[PDB]
Homo-oligomer: A and B are copies of this chain.
């Protein structure tokens, strides 16, 4: 006995259905199929006694549109709850703010996203928090570097920009044994390819700017928590730091998330073909893509990646820095020369120009974000650029 507008009780929607509908139901007041945008700072209360009945009071603390996105994101990533932020850096910084105090130690991948690196070094370390950067490719490095003061192990997989993988299940096992928080930044992967919470991570951080948005439209971040205790700590501190996502951003991301599976499938199919083309090009010294046989962590890629190997790839042009620069300066449309990644629009950048040599970022190293354009235009443009290297 269930009617139009109910899910059938006892059934779990399958993956692509969750991207379309998770966290959202038609508006109860009007039936609007999309939740309205609560572009609104404050919420009227029925009486002094009934404060917070209806659930809301002030949009810095929580907002209904933002909360619909958080419910969707928690379902997609497999978490107890999620908090959404103005940016991915805000999400990351809130984890550092909540879980570290002076005297604590934090292990971070040495090939982090650069911003994560700069916020650790140039900011939180003034609170006498010890950040140690290590090679997460071997989990025993993590196990050996954990101290009694270690509170957080912060992995990223694939890693910005070298696309190293971290074995998330094994690191989680180590972190569970040592009772330390395992935080994983899986922005490059997407939950469609890898869900760190499924593999035992305690927290996931996402830049929703990148693939969740996928359109170069909005900035955003999310923290997805494995437990209520962690979630409530993140939520409380978000209210204090004032870095919640806005209702309009959340509306845009509720919309673009619906297509994340078909976008990432297309981007990943394009990236596989581009990586194969570059691996045969004589001006190209090395290609990094988890889907080609030369990838050094192929075994882990096949264990840890679902569905696809992602839209990110990297390569090194022969001839070092001058050659990388000539190539960049001649990459034609439809490519865009710019920062960011994950978008329908294909993007290329040179991480070093825009030492570093021990992090993998060699002289002619190029990070490529593959979009959903026709792959022949993308390949023709790279081939032209490489003719100038």
Contacts of A90 in B (CB 8 A): 86, 241-243
When A48-B354, A243-B87 are in contact, do A330 and B4 touch as well, CB less than 8 Å?
yes
B37 touches A33 (CB 8 A): no
B333 touches A5 (CB 8 A): yes
Bound form: Cα–Cα A60–B210 in Å: 12
> Which of B48, B119, B243, B372 makes the CB contact (< 8 A) with A353?
B48
Bound form: Cα–Cα A48–B102 in Å: 40
Q: C-beta contact mask, A323-338 vs B, less than 8 Å → 1, else 0? A: 0010011111111111
Answer yes or no: A221 CB below 8 A from chain B CBs: yes
When A34-B217, A48-B328, A216-B34 are in contact, do A20 and B243 touch as well, CB less than 8 Å?
no
Interface-central residue, A16, A28, A118, by most chain B CB under 10 Å: A16
> Which of B8, B21, B240, B334 makes the CB contact (< 8 A) with A345?
B21
B127 touches A41 (CB 8 A): no
Bound form: Cα–Cα A289–B379 in Å: 37
A41 touches B11 (CB 8 A): no
B373 touches A20 (CB 8 A): yes
A85 touches B242 (CB 8 A): yes
Main secondary structure of the interface of A (DSSP, over half): loop
Interface-central residue, A239, A261, A373, by most chain B CB under 10 Å: A373
Bound form: Cα–Cα A27–B36 in Å: 11
Contacts of A187 in B (CB 8 A): none
B33 touches A44 (CB 8 A): yes
Oligomer: number of copies: 4
B262 touches A13 (CB 8 A): no
B127 touches A101 (CB 8 A): yes
Answer yes or no: A189 CB below 8 A from chain B CBs: no
When A4-B332, A329-B3 are in contact, do A373 and B56 touch as well, CB less than 8 Å?
no
When A32-B40, A58-B339 are in contact, do A11 and B380 touch as well, CB less than 8 Å?
yes
Interface locus among A132-140, A143-151, A251-259, A297-305: A251-259
> Which of B3, B336, B338 makes the CB contact (< 8 A) with A57?
B338
Bound form: Cα–Cα A336–B57 in Å: 12
Q: C-beta contact mask, A345-385 vs B, less than 8 Å → 1, else 0? A: 10100100110000000000000000111101100110010
The residues of A with any CB-CB pair to B shorter than 8 Å are 2-8, 11, 13-17, 20-21, 25-34, 36-49, 51, 54-60, 64-65, 85-93, 97, 101-102, 115, 118-119, 122-123, 126-128, 209, 213, 215-219, 221, 237, 239-244, 246, 248-249, 251, 255-256, 258-259, 261-263, 265-266, 325, 328-340, 343-345, 347, 350, 353-354, 371-374, 376-377, 380-381, 384
- 4 nearest CB pairs, A to B: A89-B242, A36-B36, A87-B242, A14-B374
